Amino acid sequence: GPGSGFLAAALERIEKNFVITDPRLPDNPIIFASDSFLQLTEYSREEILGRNARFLQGPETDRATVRKIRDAIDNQTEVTVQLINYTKSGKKFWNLFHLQPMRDQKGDVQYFIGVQLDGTEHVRDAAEREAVMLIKKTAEEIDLAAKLAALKAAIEAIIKRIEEAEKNGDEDKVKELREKLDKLRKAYDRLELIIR
Numbered sequence: 001g002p003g004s005g006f007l008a009a010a011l012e013r014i015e016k017n018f019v020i021t022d023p024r025l026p027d028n029p030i031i032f033a034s035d036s037f038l039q040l041t042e043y044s045r046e047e048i049l050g051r052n053a054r055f056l057q058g059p060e061t062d063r064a065t066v067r068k069i070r071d072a073i074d075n076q077t078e079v080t081v082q083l084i085n086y087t088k089s090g091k092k093f094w095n096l097f098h099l100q101p102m103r104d105q106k107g108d109v110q111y112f113i114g115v116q117l118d119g120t121e122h123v124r125d126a127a128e129r130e131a132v133m134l135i136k137k138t139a140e141e142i143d144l145a146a147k148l149a150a151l152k153a154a155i156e157a158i159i160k161r162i163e164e165a166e167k168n169g170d171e172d173k174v175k176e177l178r179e180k181l182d183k184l185r186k187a188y189d190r191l192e193l194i195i196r
């Protein structure tokens with residue numbers, strides 16, 4: 001899956017509410033969801049994976065706030081908003097939501113990270129600004145962990161290609177691919193140390 005590197009393994013036990021979406025697939029589906037997200041929303045992983053996150057919206061959701069998310073995704077920018085969402089039971093909650101693109105080493109947007117902080121009320125003022133700093137710091141910790149997981153998945157994918165080329169006696173291909181593997185390994189090791 002698009003989530004096999006996680007991300008799932010790298011991501012889902014982080015005790016934060018988040019999803020990862022893949023904007024390079026139809027309708028930017030959720031490809032990973034944290035265990036905590038499923039408990040918040042009360043949906044199962046199988047109900048959520050492969051669907052767009054908009055299912056959380058309902059009758060009182062501010063459509064102009066939703067458009068600010070829409071525009072940030074289209075523009076590939078971060079955004080922080082607060083909007084009304086509903087659990088599977090129809091329980092209303094306020095979702096203080098932070099989106100940010102996750103880039104690969106070339107700077108291209110590979111995934112979106114979305115971090116939720118649920119509450120009973122629309123927060124403002126110092127309470128809001130603090131909650132925003134929590135979810136931004138959480139998003140940064142997910143971004144680095146997910147980037148490391150994506151380098152590990154790239155290393156596994158190139159080792160498969162190297163073995164295929166070795167089986168086929170494709171030695172110019174082996175040479176090319178082993179140089180790429182050496183750069184991926186260096187990148188992986190560098191980022192591993194930073195977050196160690």
Ligand SMILES: Cc1cc2nc3c(=O)[nH]c(=O)nc-3n(C[C@H](O)[C@H](O)[C@H](O)COP(=O)(O)O)c2cc1C
Nearest residue numbers: 019021052053054056057066069070112113114116
């Ligand atoms: C990473 C990510 C997570 C999202 N999480 C939520 C969420 O928690 N609640 C929500 O109402 N929308 C969420 N969305 C927003 C919707 O998926 C969608 O982008 C929004 O409704 C605007 O597009 P639409 O007008 O086509 O629905 C998320 C989007 C992304 C990319």
Ligand SMILES: [Mg+2]
Nearest residue numbers: 027028052073
């Ligand atoms: Mg979308």
